[PDB]
Amino acid sequence: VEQVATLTAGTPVQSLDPATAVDQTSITLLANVMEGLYRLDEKNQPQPAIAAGQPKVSNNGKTYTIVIRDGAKWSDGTQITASDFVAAWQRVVDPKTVSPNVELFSAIKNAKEIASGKQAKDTLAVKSIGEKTLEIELVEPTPYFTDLLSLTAYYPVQQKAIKEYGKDYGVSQKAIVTNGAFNLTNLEGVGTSDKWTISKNKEYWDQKDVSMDKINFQVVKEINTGINLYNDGQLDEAPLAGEYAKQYKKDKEYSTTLMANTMFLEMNQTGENKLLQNKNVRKAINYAIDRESLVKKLLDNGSVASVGVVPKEMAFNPVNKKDFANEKLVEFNKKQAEEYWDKAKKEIDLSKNTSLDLLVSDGEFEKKAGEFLQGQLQDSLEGLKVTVTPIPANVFMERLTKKDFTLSLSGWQADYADPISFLANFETNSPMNHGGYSNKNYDELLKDSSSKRWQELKKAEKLLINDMGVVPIFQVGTAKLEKSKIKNVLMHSIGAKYDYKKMRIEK
């Protein structure tokens, strides 16, 4: 039996650079063609990958010492050094890089002072000792820090490759040097290609565990086509939603898996948009969304209504084991929507503009979700026109970064199992704060390191919802058909979704 498969993806690859990759498709690819110090296991816990063991923690929980294993290698056969990591991380925090991942490094001493421009990037409290030892100093004890070290943003990059390619690093398949279970062997255009192939990396330190010779990927935007290909043996998986999920729900090859992933309506609150600057308008939008109808009828695939910004089944209190997301903080209420809208009309000039644009990805169900929301908003906010604008993923990312939007159907999947993975995105000058929400009291609640941290973060979530700085819609369930012959693929509800390292084909 040939060890090959063709799997699916939701968008083209957007980045091949750890420093700049922030979307799920790019991150899944990087999790499979590259590797970091730690890699998540089947329980979403960081286990030693390039690192030879868990960190040795000293200095009252603030100093982490990590040893790189003997035989950890780049695809060109050269050793991965501690210095590769030092330079890689300096590169992420360097303001010249303009990395969307800079906030992930905030725990490390001087990362804040580098962000303000008070200090140079060489002050980042990370150093090599010899070629194989890393020492890191944190500002304070940070229980999830080993989890951060498993993220693609913390992956090394090869110093030689970075020196060679400079600003063109990651421009194409030829301008990277990787170190993972697979090599990227076919990818024509970053940002545009609907197909790519990865192949077993024989220079990978743990190549003995890898069975697949190659894995092909195909972007699927139209579910009917994915299913038809799947049934003809032209795809080994097919994504499902709506009527398609309804019909395949009882199939032996069907599964649905709940993700730590909230889809939002992000709202431009910089002042450019006069409607979304008004708090009553934002609250009207929130109350107008019939989340249960969306998930039952439109998605119908194990997705669930949002109860807050933070999704369910992600983070549990160490002391009492309670889910963080244990309060119903948002809920459909048509009459309150109508009333908040009537209140807003008294405060704004409707002559100027009574219209809101909604950006969505141009895939089948993203467009359909946008149209569902359009009808909900138009039905409860009398006189409001909502336009839906489906666009390609690379254009969508750029417009979010530039705040060239009004409303946006976009979401976040937790990178690690703590509420702060979500809540940090709404901090005043966070790169992921696309809407420009700013509440200084929210910012401060996020900094709590006391025995009451859990409670303080919940207060922050409530302040965000009370201001209605972002509208949570639904928590994503991933439904699909998958051929029975596919074995041992690791699927994660947090971080990079798929790990194909130990994948194999049986019968």
């Binding site: 939701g10 579910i223 499902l240 695939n301 089948e364 169900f365 993923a393 990312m397 994503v476």
Partner: peptide, 7 residues
């Protein structure tokens, strides 16, 4: 990480 697509 950012999710522009959910199916």
């Amino acid at each position: 990480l950012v999710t522009l697509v959910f199916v």
